[PDB]
Swiss-Prot record, chains A, B:
UniProt organism field: Bacillus subtilis (strain 168)
Localization in the cell: Cytoplasm, Nucleoid
Family per record: Belongs to the ParB family.
Effect of inactivating the gene: Increased number of chromosome origins, probably due to early DNA replication initiation. In a double soj-spo0J deletion DnaA transiently arrests for longer at its chromosomal binding sites, not just at oriC.
Name of the protein this chain belongs to: Stage 0 sporulation protein J
Function: Required for the initiation of sporulation and for normal chromosome segregation. Antagonizes sporulation inhibition by Soj. It probably interacts with a specific DNA site and other proteins involved in partitioning and cell division, and antagonizes Soj in response to cell cycle events related to chromosome partitioning.
Length: 54, 54
């Protein structure tokens, strides 16, 4: 597995919420951190993570 | 705004991907970190963040 595949997704995620996104590739034991500057973005970001549209 | 509203979502997000999730409430300037133990979960988590089902 090459992180480039996930890192190109970082680019899309940043534009998606209009915010900063960082994936930590650490022996597969990492985390994706979606930053937010308001509690409004927070509620929205959690909404995508929930995918309630489905 | 009370973090309890977002923190109850932390509980749901953890069950959603079957992984550990942490929101950092820091003056609205925080981040949601979705942890993953495989690159498979990583690809899946990014998929929800993209909400391509919509």
């Amino acid at each position: 597995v090459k992180d480039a595949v996930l890192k190109e997704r970082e680019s899309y995620l940043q534009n998606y919420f209009g915010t900063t996104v960082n994936i930590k590739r650490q022996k597969k034991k990492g985390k994706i951190e979606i930053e937010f500057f308001s509690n409004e973005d927070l509620d929205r970001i959690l909404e995508l993570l929930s995918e309630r549209e489905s």
